[PDB]
Design an enzyme around this catalytic site. Structure first.
Site, short mmCIF file in Angstrom:
data_model
loop_
_atom_site.label_atom_id
_atom_site.label_comp_id
_atom_site.label_asym_id
_atom_site.label_seq_id
_atom_site.Cartn_x
_atom_site.Cartn_y
_atom_site.Cartn_z
N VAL A 180 0.89 -1.15 0.00
CA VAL A 180 0.00 0.00 0.00
C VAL A 180 0.93 1.20 0.00
CG1 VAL A 180 -2.07 1.03 1.02
CG2 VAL A 180 -1.61 -1.41 1.29
N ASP A 181 0.92 1.95 -1.13
CA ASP A 181 1.96 2.93 -1.45
C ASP A 181 1.33 4.30 -1.70
OD1 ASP A 181 4.21 4.41 -2.27
OD2 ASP A 181 4.70 3.02 -3.94
N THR A 182 1.36 5.14 -0.68
CA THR A 182 0.74 6.48 -0.74
C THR A 182 1.55 7.36 -1.69
OG1 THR A 182 2.04 7.13 1.15
CG2 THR A 182 -0.17 6.28 1.57
#
Ligand SMILES: [K+]
EC number: 3.4.23.-
Lengths: 120, 114
Positions: A31-33
């Site tokens: 999960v890569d903001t």
């Protein structure tokens, strides 16, 4: 429908990570903001004719895929970026799911807007 | 201390070493990064396809209190990054709405003071 999503244990995403079923197959994402768009790295199923510049080169979007979450389903299209080490769930999907990422010392949890497990 | 100092959302502006720094909050980054005038550098470094130096420790000002943290100085990064090292130290939470996000502390309070 995705094809083979195996072999992820050779380059596993770090936490925060979540495994979802996408086009019928389990995919483990970082999960890569830091990513505007979500990414599949391998066997992504049929591709649209639309593409995006990834800063850098150009990659194609998939057609729509069903994304199975712990307690619901969404439709989403992903960029097929094989030159990425792992599948990314980027801001496009985070905003769509109103997801929350919780850091714990012991790693990270990724939940829905009501604290519900997202991960299959 | 930092010398003279745009990221997309989730963004946060924090006082670091006496100067305001606007960071991308980047769960894809192991280490936090400063890109410009990061003050005195340590002799320790990390490989990232390249090797960069760690800063010496910097006071980081949050609504939740202050913490001490060293950053990697990576000029060839387009903006400062607040990475998993600090997010875990803070037990931070990132909450997305439809058109943006809020970075908040272990009990729901915004982390930014500015
Ligand atoms: K997999």
């Amino acid at each position: 429908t995705l094809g083979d999503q195996g072999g992820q244990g050779q380059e596993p995403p770090p936490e925060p990570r979540i495994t979802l079923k996408v086009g019928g197959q389990p995919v483990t994402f970082l999960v890569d903001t830091g990513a505007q768009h979500s990414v599949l790295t391998q066997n992504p199923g049929p591709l649209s004719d639309k593409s995006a510049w990834v800063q850098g080169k150009r990659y194609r979007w998939t057609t729509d895929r069903k994304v199975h979450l712990a307690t619901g389903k969404v439709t989403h299209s992903f960029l097929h970026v094989p030159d990425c080490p792992y599948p990314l769930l980027g801001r496009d999907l985070l905003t769509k799911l109103k997801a929350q990422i919780h850091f714990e010392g012991s790693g990270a949890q990724v939940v829905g807007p009501m604290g519900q497990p997202l991960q299959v």
